[PDB]
Design a protein around this ligand. Structure first.
Ligand code: FES
Ligand code: FES
Lengths: 104, 104
């Protein structure tokens, strides 16, 4: 599936993901700046945090409870589309997904 | 990933799924009774309906707008877990997923 990453300082990365890859894996494997897997997908580091662009927020689904716990406690206020990219796994429904990378 | 289908009359089917299969595709390919894909995954026939069970309800996420609309229009019972299985796609987070198959 096609996944787009908004670097709102520089433009949109378009990557071709495979099914079952986590969003964080598709970013770190395609050199998308701003996503780092410090804790390796354990919902501790919150460094992989991404923002689902509005149209896709219902598709992707709200954050899991562990995500919601972490994202409401570590740093920036979360919104409807805020997710840990390590918790979002690519699948056919997500072809064309647009996500924004919280950046500098 | 492992998926479990409850026939509440009969027991629990256990199936090994692959990433990127829809849950409906998992049910129909492994002979899980009560799941029919009449419209073939276009959110019309609603004969693929399931109910996510237990703590999987947050993991999978609520129904998408097309599912909610269809489940409203057809008067189908909808709980927090109610999904069109054709709209739910297997990915690594769902290993162990338990869903209820509404049966007779
Ligand atoms: S990689 Fe640490 S929270 Fe996602
Ligand atoms: S197959 Fe018809 S709505 Fe799922």
């Amino acid at each position: 599936p096609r996944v787009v990453f908004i670097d709102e300082q520089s433009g949109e990365y378009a990557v071709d993901a495979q099914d079952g890859q986590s969003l964080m894996e598709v970013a770190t494997q395609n050199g998308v700046p701003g996503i780092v897997a410090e804790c390796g997908g354990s919902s501790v580091c919150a460094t992989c945090r991404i923002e689902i662009e509005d149209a896709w927020v219902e598709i992707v689904g709200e954050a899991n409870p562990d995500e919601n716990d972490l994202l409401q406690s570590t740093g920036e206020p979360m919104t409807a589309g805020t997710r840990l990219s390590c918790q979002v796994f690519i699948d056919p429904s997500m072809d064309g997904l647009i996500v924004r990378v919280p950046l500098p």
